[PDB]
Amino acid sequence: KTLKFMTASSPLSPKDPNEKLILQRLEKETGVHIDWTNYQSDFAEKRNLDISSGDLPDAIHNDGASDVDLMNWAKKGVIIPVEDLIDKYMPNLKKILDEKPEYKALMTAPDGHIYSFPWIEELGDGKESIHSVNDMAWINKDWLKKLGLEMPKTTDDLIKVLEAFKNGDPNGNGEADEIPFSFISGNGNEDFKFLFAAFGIGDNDDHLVVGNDGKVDFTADNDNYKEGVKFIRQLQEKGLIDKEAFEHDWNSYIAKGHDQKFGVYFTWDKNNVTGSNESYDVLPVLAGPSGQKHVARTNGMGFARDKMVITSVNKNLELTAKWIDAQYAPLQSVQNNWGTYGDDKQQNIFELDQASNSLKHLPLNGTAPAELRQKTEVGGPLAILDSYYGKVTTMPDDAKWRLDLIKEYYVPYMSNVNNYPRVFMTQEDLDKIAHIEADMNDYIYRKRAEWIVNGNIDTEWDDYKKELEKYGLSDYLAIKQKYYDQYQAN
Ligand SMILES: OC[C@@H]1O[C@H](O[C@]2(CO[C@]3(CO[C@]4(CO[C@]5(CO)O[C@H](CO)[C@@H](O)[C@@H]5O)O[C@H](CO)[C@@H](O)[C@@H]4O)O[C@H](CO)[C@@H](O)[C@@H]3O)O[C@H](CO)[C@H](O)[C@H]2O)[C@H](O)[C@H](O)[C@@H]1O
Ligand SMILES: [Ca+2]
Ligand SMILES: [Ca+2]
């Protein structure tokens, strides 16, 4: 009747998840009450403390564990394999794996086991996938018009435009408050690395792309990569970059965005940052000095291996298996991912069409989509399939919109036929990767920011590449190539 789950949630959502409208209804439908350990910041560190201290719940919900954490917890009996539970008790998930057996392959570790329950969300395929580009570039069209500038078409045009922003007071308040170029450095949706491809190849959060020769490329040791750093260095030297770019956080970014202080900035959806207005639009793909005109593909996709694991201290496997499966009901999945209907005390993402027993997205009327979603979503293991649109739920209008934009502006410039596939390496290979990445990942972003602030990449470039080799890049790259080959050979 009672299970104890650990979970992750947004600091905008209730400290107690049972305050969420979805979870109140779910209790009345499963008849299972969940007592939550809900971490709303630094979830992974806090999860690792609990596991290390032996302070295990029945299951970790909305977990987001890496594959190396999954295999290590599995080698040690922290979590259990779950395939027999799916076959015995999970008809909603079994039906999904019937329709789309490809995901079953993605859930199966090389030792034949399944250790987690995935998040599945189909929104585009291949180049047209909503994940192809995460850190989209946006520009203040109102400043362009005010200053009589055309949309920039090249990186050189971008510099000239940005200097106008710094110097031309297009907000008209008589102060040089204009921030020409902003970002939030590192992984994720507000980084600037989307522009590195205007110098050829570019970059992504993996620092990994697949060349058309079949050979994976570590992007962050290319000359094109150095040229992109040199480009941002020009912007810094020219006083075009947000004074705060390497210190501020999301909440500060969004404050500035709401005051419309940005010339060009990066984000998933401008509505989350500069709001619902036509002051900002997509910065179209720019041509580099030599006519480079490219969009690097991310390796992202509408699949996450682990949004739930089951711990070895879980004493009612059947009930837990059946609770989980209730999330894989179409209508439930839709809500768990995106929000709910019929709250009279808070804005609703959905309305319930009782005529069709189906969900209809409502208009946000200026509410930031990520803001209302964070409060009312649940996360966790769920599947939303392409066959659900027009049947179970409307497609979200911000997802349909973004997909249109990806087709319009970006897909024509994705010259790479392949990106890196979602492979499940062996545990021996995962721990090798994890040792190299322990050195490499921080180091790459550290050098990148030092180089934009000092100006010595040209003097430091070769030492940096040797250092990456001492950290094991060739080994790192050889492993990734092996799995790409095995994936292509099937
Ligand atoms: O790193 C912490 C960890 O991140 C994990 O997920 C997030 C994103 O979760 C959301 C994502 O919401 C969107 C993107 O959603 C889709 C694509 O899946 O895009 C469509 C709209 O264009 C939408 O229909 C699709 O579902 O991302 C923007 C905000 O960036 C939203 O407007 C949009 O819905 O992020 C939201 C706010 O955090 C959350 O409500 C959503 O679930 O990964 C990125 C980090 O790289 C997010 O920070 C993180 O949320 C993981 O789910 C986990 O929950 C933690 O966030
Ligand atoms: Ca001004
Ligand atoms: Ca390379």
Side-chain angles (χ1 to χ4, degrees):
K1 186 168 273 288
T2 278
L3 307 161
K4 186 169 190 135
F5 294 166
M6 185 183 86
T7 186
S9 62
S10 164
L12 303 196
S13 82
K15 174 187 248 288
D16 177 22
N18 287 321
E19 292 305 320
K20 285 179 168 167
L21 187 41
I22 287 176
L23 296 186
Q24 288 163 11
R25 309 199 177 120
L26 186 71
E27 191 171 346
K28 300 218 276 208
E29 296 197 54
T30 58
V32 186
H33 174 78
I34 299 300
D35 294 305
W36 299 93
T37 298
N38 177 25
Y39 295 131
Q40 309 195 292
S41 59
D42 295 286
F43 162 80
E45 289 88 4
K46 284 161 192 186
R47 150 165 68 55
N48 297 338
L49 288 164
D50 294 354
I51 301 170
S52 313
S53 82
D55 206 82
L56 293 188
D58 298 311
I60 303 179
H61 170 273
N62 209 19
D63 190 19
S66 57
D67 299 348
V68 62
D69 285 337
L70 268 178
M71 289 310 298
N72 286 350
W73 300 337
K75 180 151 151 187
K76 273 191 190 172
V78 184
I79 50 165
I80 64 175
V82 299
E83 58 269 0
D84 299 347
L85 296 175
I86 297 150
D87 195 37
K88 282 145 143 276
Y89 310 110
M90 312 187 63
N92 296 348
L93 175 57
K94 283 214 295 289
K95 191 177 171 276
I96 293 152
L97 297 186
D98 287 334
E99 296 179 43
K100 315 288 275 185
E102 39 257 87
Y103 295 120
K104 173 141 182 181
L106 290 171
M107 304 157 57
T108 309
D111 69 16
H113 289 294
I114 299 175
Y115 294 110
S116 59
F117 300 96
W119 168 83
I120 298 173
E121 168 188 280
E122 303 182 337
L123 290 164
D125 174 71
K127 288 170 182 199
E128 303 201 339
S129 156
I130 198 172
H131 309 273
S132 295
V133 169
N134 68 323
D135 65 329
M136 285 180 184
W138 311 84
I139 186 162
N140 189 319
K141 247 167 163 151
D142 287 358
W143 293 359
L144 287 175
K145 182 150 217 198
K146 151 78 171 83
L147 289 160
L149 305 152
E150 303 171 47
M151 183 74 68
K153 292 141 60 157
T154 77
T155 57
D156 277 86
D157 289 347
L158 181 51
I159 302 172
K160 309 179 171 186
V161 161
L162 283 178
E163 265 158 351
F165 290 172
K166 182 192 34 177
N167 292 333
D169 189 34
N171 63 11
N173 63 4
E175 182 34 53
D177 63 342
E178 277 90 4
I179 301 168
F181 186 85
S182 204
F183 53 83
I184 301 172
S185 181
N187 300 313
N189 297 341
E190 288 65 42
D191 192 51
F192 60 74
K193 73 174 59 74
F194 161 84
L195 288 183
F196 273 38
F199 299 80
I201 305 172
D203 187 40
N204 61 42
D205 288 341
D206 288 319
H207 311 307
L208 264 193
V209 302
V210 177
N212 288 330
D213 46 10
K215 291 313 169 288
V216 317
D217 186 12
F218 179 80
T219 56
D221 70 346
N222 301 337
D223 289 336
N224 310 73
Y225 181 93
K226 168 152 65 65
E227 290 300 310
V229 175
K230 295 179 64 59
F231 184 64
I232 306 281
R233 168 58 180 174
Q234 276 181 283
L235 293 189
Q236 174 80 3
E237 276 171 359
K238 279 167 180 296
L240 305 176
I241 297 188
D242 194 319
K243 72 196 202 331
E244 253 197 323
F246 290 103
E247 285 83 20
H248 60 191
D249 79 324
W250 170 254
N251 277 306
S252 159
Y253 203 71
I254 265 54
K256 273 129 65 187
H258 174 259
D259 296 335
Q260 283 216 355
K261 298 218 196 125
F262 292 151
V264 170
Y265 74 99
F266 301 88
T267 199
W268 186 269
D269 182 338
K270 60 171 193 181
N271 284 288
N272 288 324
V273 176
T274 56
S276 296
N277 49 59
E278 280 197 288
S279 286
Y280 282 88
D281 210 342
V282 182
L283 179 71
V285 170
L286 299 172
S290 303
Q292 310 101 311
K293 202 179 173 177
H294 190 63
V295 176
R297 292 172 74 187
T298 66
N299 308 314
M301 71 181 283
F303 171 83
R305 185 159 280 143
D306 167 31
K307 277 315 174 69
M308 184 122 65
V309 295
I310 293 183
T311 83
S312 64
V313 309
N314 191 315
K315 259 38 193 153
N316 198 330
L317 299 191
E318 174 155 6
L319 184 62
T320 297
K322 298 211 190 169
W323 187 92
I324 299 170
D325 195 61
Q327 321 309 313
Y328 283 104
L331 278 167
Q332 192 66 64
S333 286
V334 176
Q335 283 174 85
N336 286 8
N337 199 45
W338 286 322
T340 191
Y341 58 95
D343 200 355
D344 44 301
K345 316 303 203 193
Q346 178 165 50
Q347 198 183 346
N348 291 283
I349 286 287
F350 293 108
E351 73 176 347
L352 188 41
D353 201 315
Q354 72 305 333
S356 50
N357 194 28
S358 65
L359 295 151
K360 293 206 315 227
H361 286 79
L362 300 174
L364 300 174
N365 312 121
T367 295
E371 170 186 318
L372 185 49
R373 169 163 189 198
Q374 286 178 61
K375 310 170 134 166
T376 59
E377 75 183 333
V378 155
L382 58 96
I384 300 166
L385 298 200
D386 185 64
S387 62
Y388 295 2
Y389 308 126
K391 185 169 104 215
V392 186
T393 186
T394 53
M395 180 160 280
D397 320 285
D398 63 340
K400 175 176 199 317
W401 171 67
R402 195 173 210 267
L403 285 163
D404 285 346
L405 290 177
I406 289 177
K407 210 201 292 184
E408 201 207 311
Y409 290 96
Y410 299 144
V411 172
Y413 299 110
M414 307 188 196
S415 308
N416 296 66
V417 183
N418 298 119
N419 66 2
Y420 199 79
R422 189 67 174 110
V423 303
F424 204 145
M425 310 189 164
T426 69
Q427 200 222 322
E428 186 185 343
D429 283 339
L430 284 166
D431 280 304
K432 194 131 154 248
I433 292 302
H435 288 78
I436 292 155
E437 290 188 355
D439 289 315
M440 214 168 52
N441 291 350
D442 281 337
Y443 174 74
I444 285 149
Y445 285 137
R446 199 190 90 216
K447 297 303 297 178
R448 187 184 72 166
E450 294 169 4
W451 283 336
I452 293 179
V453 155
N454 82 32
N456 311 313
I457 187 171
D458 278 319
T459 306
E460 298 183 0
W461 187 245
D462 304 325
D463 302 283
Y464 158 86
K465 299 200 280 178
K466 294 200 197 139
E467 197 69 5
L468 295 169
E469 197 42 63
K470 189 65 222 86
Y471 295 147
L473 183 55
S474 67
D475 277 336
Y476 184 79
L477 222 38
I479 295 176
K480 296 275 174 175
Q481 190 61 55
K482 177 182 56 162
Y483 286 90
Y484 184 73
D485 299 332
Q486 293 185 5
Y487 169 89
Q488 285 295 120
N490 286 282

